Design a protein around this ligand. Structure first.
Ligand SMILES: [Mg+2]
Ligand SMILES: [Mg+2]
Ligand SMILES: [Mg+2]
Ligand SMILES: [Mg+2]
Ligand SMILES: [Mg+2]
Ligand SMILES: [Mg+2]
Ligand SMILES: [Mg+2]
Ligand SMILES: [Mg+2]
Ligand SMILES: [Mg+2]
Ligand SMILES: [Mg+2]
Ligand SMILES: [Mg+2]
Ligand SMILES: [Mg+2]
Ligand SMILES: [Mg+2]
Ligand SMILES: [Mg+2]
Ligand SMILES: [Mg+2]
Ligand SMILES: [Mg+2]
Ligand SMILES: [Mg+2]
Ligand SMILES: [Mg+2]
Ligand SMILES: [Mg+2]
Ligand SMILES: [Mg+2]
Ligand SMILES: [Mg+2]
Ligand SMILES: [Mg+2]
Ligand SMILES: [Mg+2]
Ligand SMILES: [Mg+2]
Ligand SMILES: [Mg+2]
Ligand SMILES: [Mg+2]
Ligand SMILES: [Mg+2]
Ligand SMILES: [Mg+2]
Ligand SMILES: [Mg+2]
Ligand SMILES: [Mg+2]
Ligand SMILES: [Mg+2]
Ligand SMILES: [Mg+2]
Ligand SMILES: [Mg+2]
Ligand SMILES: [Mg+2]
Ligand SMILES: [Mg+2]
Ligand SMILES: [Mg+2]
Ligand SMILES: [Mg+2]
Ligand SMILES: [Mg+2]
Ligand SMILES: [Mg+2]
Ligand SMILES: [Mg+2]
Ligand SMILES: [Mg+2]
Ligand SMILES: [Mg+2]
Ligand SMILES: [Mg+2]
Ligand SMILES: [Mg+2]
Ligand SMILES: [Mg+2]
Ligand SMILES: [Mg+2]
Ligand SMILES: [Mg+2]
Ligand SMILES: [Zn+2]
Ligand SMILES: [Zn+2]
Lengths: 141, 69, 181, 110, 189, 53
RNA sequence: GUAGAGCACUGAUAGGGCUAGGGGGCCCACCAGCCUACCAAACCCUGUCAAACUCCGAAGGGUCCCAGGUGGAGCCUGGG
RNA sequence: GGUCGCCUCCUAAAAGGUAACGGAGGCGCCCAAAGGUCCCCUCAGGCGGGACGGAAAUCCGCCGGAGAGCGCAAGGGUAG
RNA sequence: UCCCCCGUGCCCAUAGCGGCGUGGAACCACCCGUUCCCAUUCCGAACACGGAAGUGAAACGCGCCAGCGCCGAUGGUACUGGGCGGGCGACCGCCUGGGAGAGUAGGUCGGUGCGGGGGA
């Protein structure tokens, strides 16, 4: 999993999600990255899920980079309880993701091989995705 | 100075062990030390005195090599 | 301001060897003493008994001045400190009182220690000063024996307008410092 | 970063400045002593009487007492009575003190 | 090596329209000039993929004046990851600071140990006159084991060129692979 | 107040009428209070003390 | 002082360099060798997240002056 | 079951104000010095030195704009 | 009336840090002493007086450059007051005034106001 080992407050507000991403819009370490196309709350259990996927795809090899880190606490009321009497309890953590953000990028492996281990990676993901190539544009910022 | 708390340092002599009348301005009218600067196993050369050895190791104890070599 | 033979030794002997050494241009930039802070940080009369100043009277007989106390910065469980207890003493020696103290330590007191073997030379500051310490208190016979009690010592810095540790040594060595190395 | 010297200035300076009444700054070097009356609104000097321009010499304190009395004449003739005393980063005593007692007896008002 | 590209002018007409017109907005400037320009997205793409911020761009104008240029910053529209505005730094003699590529060569020991090469920088900041703007800078990475790293100072640096960034900055390194063997006790704690 | 912090009316001397009241501690300084206080009654400054509240 | 944005502060943070400590070596076990595809503080680089973080900062909103504004405007004292 | 008055921050959408069994914390005292004033001093911290004496007892050196302190919670403030 | 120092504001780091040089003629600083007034939880360190041998080494004044700090546009984008639109929904987009923060090109080792002194 991926808890932030420590934190300033425990329960976090919910928040909107208006518009286009803030940063993380260019490859930076790998040579191929995975790109978000629609807003989301990606979960500690998904990030992990997608990661493990590729690692088991090119077993012994590559270097997986992971650009979004689940810091926000997903909160939720128990079952058979009604509205109010406290705010929900924490179960799991998430990372806010807008469209354009890179989430994974792998470095150093056969072009075919990265193009799969990032393809499979997307299916573990709750959203639409596009794989991308490191770029003159990317090295241009 | 802020008087009324300080030991009045008159002129005074520190008459030492061997020579050296370390004439000074002392807080006592006459104090007496027995060891001085000039004489010291450090100030003046390495200085011999007693310090020559203790258990001389080893051939330097002499008369070694009694057989044929 | 007083006829002391070390004041005169610094001038009529120590001043020149330094100008011939590090080849100074101007006269003030030549290395020169400033103070001798003597810290008798006892830490043993905190909420402990009176008698603290029973050294700060012999401390006066050494240094000619009256020592003024130092208090507890902050409370510590492991030392028994509450923010305010007195732990030690400190006298700052400026002007001729400073000199005449060294004109007794450097050539009478330093040899009055048993198993004495010069001075530690690594202990120079970095911007031109030097310090160490001492344990035995009747190391100057101004403090005579039948003023007998528990023996305690002092931390001693000496402060100079030396600009590096290098030239600094040359001063303190030239004014009679036996160096162990 | 600051020296205790310049802090003491501001400090002693700041207060007096808040009461609006005129300002008799007292500058003092090991050689001479100077002073000048200032309106601090417009930021201008009313009258300046110094030990150096007066070409006086003969003991520093007693030198000043005149330079103080000198300042009062050169200002009364101008219309100033009300003026509060700035004592710089110096303890009011002796030299600065003199300048005041001089200005005081010359008819000046603080 | 050194590329030419057609260009034109922007008076004030709407960027939004030029963009949907397929012509990219832009600007060029130095220390004496500032000029609103516009290029052509297709054509710009052609060149910039080859060029980037590394090689030289010759801006051909309607008045027929040519211009020596470096792209300074490219703005990308986030949702799309597509061009929306470039800065064109026209060069005088003065040794402008700029980024030149690096060529990693000689397979490291770690890469024959099944490791990987983490080349952090693909470029490098330099002060260097236009009269000799280099390309491939030599980097000998053959002899780095896994975990080992080569820094900045240790570099060829073709004479007449100044290492215009940190000495102990880190250009490239070599790290362990990805074992599924890892995945085992990765789980444990 | 509480119990270690007692309430008290500042007494008097130069007319023996009380004219003030405040607070103090008897576990800290366990004596009788001390302040100069002009009075509307004697029209003079006077040294004062205490009694319970 | 918000949206944005940012990391200067309070914290989070993934990779890298550096690097106290800690752990596995192991030389050896008296002190000491300083060697580590292991952990890891403080720091530097790339790269990021925050209602109770802000080096910055909109549109906007408030309000006073001036002008337009004759309206089932406005203002005061009262009865329902 | 929890709550009930007062204080701090956030929610609160850049004046004020603003709800919820919304997220977080404090008060029911204390001080004849911790008050008045006139005077003087400047921190936390980090690196080097320092007999006991250490991570930190007191000491010396450069280093530092406020990250310390300001009785107690938090915020604003604060070395001119 | 230009120049130089001393005092003192105004501006709020483009002014600062660090660096190289530098000026004692006059001012200013260190400085000489500790009798006197004044002072140190110890010390003439500071503050204080009495002077004037030395010195501009320190501090300070003035010059020099961009290593840091700092100021930093134009173009464009974010967001947005007003007005509209297509989506089954998630959300996107259009006209209209407004328009950042980052970042680029660059700027900066200050500018000043009255008083005093001192040479053009
Ligand atoms: Mg979904
Ligand atoms: Mg004799
Ligand atoms: Mg004499
Ligand atoms: Mg201290
Ligand atoms: Mg003004
Ligand atoms: Mg526009
Ligand atoms: Mg090409
Ligand atoms: Mg967009
Ligand atoms: Mg190694
Ligand atoms: Mg009454
Ligand atoms: Mg980690
Ligand atoms: Mg070990
Ligand atoms: Mg080794
Ligand atoms: Mg090693
Ligand atoms: Mg760090
Ligand atoms: Mg975000
Ligand atoms: Mg916010
Ligand atoms: Mg701010
Ligand atoms: Mg506005
Ligand atoms: Mg109003
Ligand atoms: Mg009515
Ligand atoms: Mg109101
Ligand atoms: Mg008080
Ligand atoms: Mg102090
Ligand atoms: Mg400290
Ligand atoms: Mg100690
Ligand atoms: Mg210690
Ligand atoms: Mg606060
Ligand atoms: Mg103004
Ligand atoms: Mg320089
Ligand atoms: Mg120069
Ligand atoms: Mg020179
Ligand atoms: Mg010079
Ligand atoms: Mg000179
Ligand atoms: Mg005092
Ligand atoms: Mg003092
Ligand atoms: Mg100039
Ligand atoms: Mg230079
Ligand atoms: Mg710069
Ligand atoms: Mg703009
Ligand atoms: Mg828009
Ligand atoms: Mg409006
Ligand atoms: Mg609208
Ligand atoms: Mg749409
Ligand atoms: Mg420039
Ligand atoms: Mg400068
Ligand atoms: Mg002249
Ligand atoms: Zn002898
Ligand atoms: Zn009465």
């Amino acid at each position: 999993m991926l808890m932030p080992r420590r934190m300033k407050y425990r329960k976090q507000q919910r928040g909107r999600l208006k518009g286009a991403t803030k940063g993380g819009d260019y490859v930076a370490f790998g040579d191929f990255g995975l790109v978000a196309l629609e807003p989301a709350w990606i979960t500690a259990q998904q990030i992990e899920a997608a990661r493990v996927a590729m690692v088991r795809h090119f077993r012994r090899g590559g270097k997986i980079f992971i650009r979004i880190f689940p810091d926000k606490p997903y909160t939720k009321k128990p079952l058979e309880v009604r509205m109010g009497k406290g705010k929900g309890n924490v179960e799991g953590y998430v990372a806010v993701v807008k469209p354009g953000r890179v989430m994974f990028e792998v470095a150093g492996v056969t072009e075919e091989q990265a193009m799969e281990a990032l393809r499979i990676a997307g299916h573990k993901l709750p959203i639409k995705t596009k794989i991308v190539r490191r770029d003159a544009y990317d090295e241009a910022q | 100075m802020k008087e009324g708390i300080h030991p009045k340092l008159v002129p005074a002599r520190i008459i030492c062990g061997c020579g050296n009348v370390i004439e000074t301005y002392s807080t006592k009218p006459e104090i007496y030390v027995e060891v001085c600067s000039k004489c010291h196993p450090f100030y003046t050369g390495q200085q011999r005195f007693v310090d020559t050895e203790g258990r001389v190791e080893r051939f330097q104890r002499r008369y070694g090599d009694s057989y044929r070599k | 301001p007083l006829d002391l033979a070390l004041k005169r030794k610094y001038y009529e002997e120590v001043r020149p060897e330094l100008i011939r050494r590090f080849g100074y241009q101007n006269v003030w930039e030549v290395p020169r003493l400033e103070k001798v802070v003597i810290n008798q940080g006892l830490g043993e009369a905190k909420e402990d008994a009176r008698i603290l100043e029973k050294a700060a009277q012999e401390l006066a007989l050494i240094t000619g001045q009256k020592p003024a106390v130092t208090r507890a910065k902050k409370s510590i469980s492991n030392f028994k400190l509450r923010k305010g207890m007195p732990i030690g003493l400190r006298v700052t020696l400026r002007r001729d009182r400073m000199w005449i103290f060294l004109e007794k330590l450097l050539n009478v007191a330093l040899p009055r220690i048993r198993d004495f073997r010069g001075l530690n030379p690594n202990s120079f500051d970095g911007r031109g000063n030097y310090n160490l310490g001492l344990r035995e208190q009747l190391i100057f016979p101004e403090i005579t024996y039948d003023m007998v009690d528990a023996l305690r010592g002092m931390d001693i810095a000496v402060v100079t307008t030396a600009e590096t540790d290098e030239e600094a040594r040359a001063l303190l060595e030239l004014l009679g410092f036996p160096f162990r190395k | 970063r600051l020296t205790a010297y310049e802090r003491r200035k501001f400090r002693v300076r700041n207060r007096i400045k808040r009461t609006g009444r005129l300002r008799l700054s007292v500058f003092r070097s090991l050689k001479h002593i100077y002073a000048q009356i200032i309106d601090d609104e417009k930021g201008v000097t009313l009258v300046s009487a110094s030990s150096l321009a007066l070409k006086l010499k003969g003991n520093k304190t007693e030198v000043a007492r005149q330079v103080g009395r000198a300042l009062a004449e050169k200002a009364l003739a101008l219309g100033i009575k009300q003026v509060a005393f700035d004592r710089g980063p110096y303890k009011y005593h002796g030299r600065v003190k003199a300048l005041a007692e001089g200005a005081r007896e010359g008819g000046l008002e603080f | 090596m050194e590329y030419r590209l057609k260009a034109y002018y922007r008076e004030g007409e709407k960027p939004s329209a030029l963009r949907r017109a397929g012509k990219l907005p832009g600007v060029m400037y130095n220390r004496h000039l500032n000029r609103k320009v516009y290029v052509d997205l297709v054509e710009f793409d052609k060149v910039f993929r080859q060029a980037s911020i590394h090689h030289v761009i010759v801006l051909e104008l309607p008045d027929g004046q040519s211009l020596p240029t470096l792209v300074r910053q490219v703005n990308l529209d986030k949702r799309r990851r597509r061009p929306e505005h470039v800065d064109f730094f026209v060069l005088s003699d003065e040794p402008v600071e700029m980024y030149v590529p690096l060529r990693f060569v000689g397979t490291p020991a770690g890469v024959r140990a099944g490791g990987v090469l983490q080349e952090i920088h693909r470029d490098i900041l330099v002060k260097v006159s236009p009269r000799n703007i280099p390309e491939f800078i030599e980097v000998d990475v053959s002899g780095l084991e896994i975990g080992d790293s080569l820094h900045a100072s240790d570099l060829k640096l073709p004479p007449g060129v100044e290492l215009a960034v940190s000495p102990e900055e880190t250009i490239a390194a070599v790290v362990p692979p990805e074992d599924v063997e890892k995945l085992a006790e990765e789980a444990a704690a | 107040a509480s119990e270690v912090r007692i309430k008290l009316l500042l007494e008097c001397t130069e007319c023996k009428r009380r004219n003030y009241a405040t607070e103090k501690n008897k576990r800290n300084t366990p004596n009788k209070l001390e302040l100069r206080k002009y009075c509307p009654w004697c029209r003079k400054h006077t040294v004062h003390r205490e009694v319970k509240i």
